[PDB]
């Protein structure tokens, strides 16, 4: 349409090993996130499939607090060896007002300090749809807090996903 805005929703260096963060955020998040971060994630249900796999669809439901209610994420590519997942939001109200279509890539990279986690959004914008930092800062801030809580859980539970 008007174009694509690609932006980094999270760039987070962590002492936790990348295989473990990958499992927590992309593979087993439907179990972990409602337990560990209920203030950000009410529940996650499989709309299609019953395990994280290419083609599955997970619906993430946000608390009443949240400015949006839900998102349906279709998993299009998984490269577990590279700790990489790509999904497409096929339905939901979590978009910045002016987004026709949104694609996300969650990547975890091995570093010397531990991991570097990058979550990248590709926002396809409608005709003359203005977009500003204030439109994505709430998501950026919420994601950092979620990561913080998940990181602490994995530190406190060193064998989980090891």
Numbering used by the authors: 0 to 161
How is this structure described in the published paper?
Like the structures of other PR-10 proteins (Aglas et al., 2020; Morris et al., 2021), HcPR10 was composed of a seven-stranded β-sheet (β1-β7), two closely connected V-shaped α-helices (α1-α2) between β1 and β2, a long C-terminal α-helix (α3) and eight loops (L1-L8) connecting these structural elements. HcPR10 formed a pinecone-shaped structure, with the twisted seven-stranded β-sheet and the long C-terminal helix forming the top surface of this structure and the curved V-shaped helices forming the bottom. The structural analysis support that HcPR10 is a cytokinin-binding protein that acts as a reservoir for cytokinins and helps maintain cytokinin homeostasis, thereby guaranteeing stable transmission of cytokinin signals in plant cells.
Inside the pinecone-shaped structure was a large cavity mainly composed of hydrophobic residues that may favor hydrophobic ligand binding. The cavity also contained several hydrophilic residues, allowing water molecules to bind inside the cavity in the apo-form structure. The cavity had a volume of ~1,339 Å3 and contained one entrance located at the surface close to the top of the pinecone-shaped structure. The entrance was surrounded by the long C-terminal helix, loops connecting α2, and β2 (L2), β3 and β4 (L4) and β5 and β6 (L6). The entrance was approximately 5.9 Å wide and 16 Å long, which was large enough for the internal insertion of a small ligand.
